[PDB]
Design a protein around this ligand. Sequence first.
Ligand SMILES: [Zn+2]
Lengths: 280, 126
Amino acid sequence: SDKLKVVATNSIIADMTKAIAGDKIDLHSIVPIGQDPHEYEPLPEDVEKTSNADVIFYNGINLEDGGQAWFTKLVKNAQKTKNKDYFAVSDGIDVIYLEGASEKGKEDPHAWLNLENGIIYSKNIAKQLIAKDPKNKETYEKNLKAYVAKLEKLDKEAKSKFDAIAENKKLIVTSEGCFKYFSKAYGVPSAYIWEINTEEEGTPDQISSLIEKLKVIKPSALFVESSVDRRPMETVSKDSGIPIYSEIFTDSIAKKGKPGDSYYAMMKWNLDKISEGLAK
Amino acid sequence: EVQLVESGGGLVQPGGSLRLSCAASGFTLDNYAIGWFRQAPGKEREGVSCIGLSAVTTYDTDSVKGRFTISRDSARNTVYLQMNSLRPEDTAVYFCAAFPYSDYCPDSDDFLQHRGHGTQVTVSSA
Ligand SMILES: [Zn+2]
């Protein structure tokens, strides 16, 4: 059989596609596991796979798109058409904006850390899988129904995950300010070193502005993302004495068979490790 | 703490079926993927079926797709492998392994931390 050729920009979107499609498609993911998906140089295999793809999925909302951004260049060089060849899986989410003045009101891309947005992403993916490969529409709708139900159950769990923490140590601290959608959905405020990965990552003023906040609000743990350099947060851990309780998953899933190796698993890991860390 | 014990193997006629069980006698088993693996003499370890913590099933070895099915009984803390149309090439030690906070099972070049002793499956006519 001549399977649908799908390209996804990063491992999160690729995994959601895999949850809908199973083994029915030919799926390529551009940004490798553990790498930053905001700025990446596609390889010749990536450019080739993108040209031959039947459908391309990207995050949108200022993750890999925009002026001179890597995905924008990629699809423009391949002569692809928006909403015919390539689709933003975030279409339909309620966008939250970056707050730093230098970011001039641009969108914050990290919608998927709200499980309800993960459901929106998955529905957008299934829509285009069915529209371009109707022969497998039955599988796509059965997987979509089962997957959405699992994400909905995890979303219910997330909404009660932090009820035992006192509203004085409810602070999720990560390197990148990637938790705005999680904070909004689940009632746990967040702080960061740098707001978005495209800024400079770990300057003295960023680290000091965070250390001052860790003096007012003092949580029992810090966390480090799997896709960032750990050194800035280790410095934050030095000057504050607060331990890095675990790594968490924001911009990438983990490798197959390790903890957090899917969208579902990375969110269950995040919910468990963050709540256990903040209670210590 | 995670303990896995297999059962159900032995000598089986070519063409027949066999159901293996993986009994999990640790706990918090709902947060683990469970994979069935096999090792035949002179070959690499093959992951033949996997069920993730979200209940998604995956089949990483093409030569058993459609013949092998994995399932989970959460109340029993047991994972079953149903093997059909068994071939001489399926003779192996079959073992299960557990992967915390995983939906998928590792490829052959990854190390494997929680696994059972394994059960011999020999496909031949005696
Ligand atoms: Zn990011």
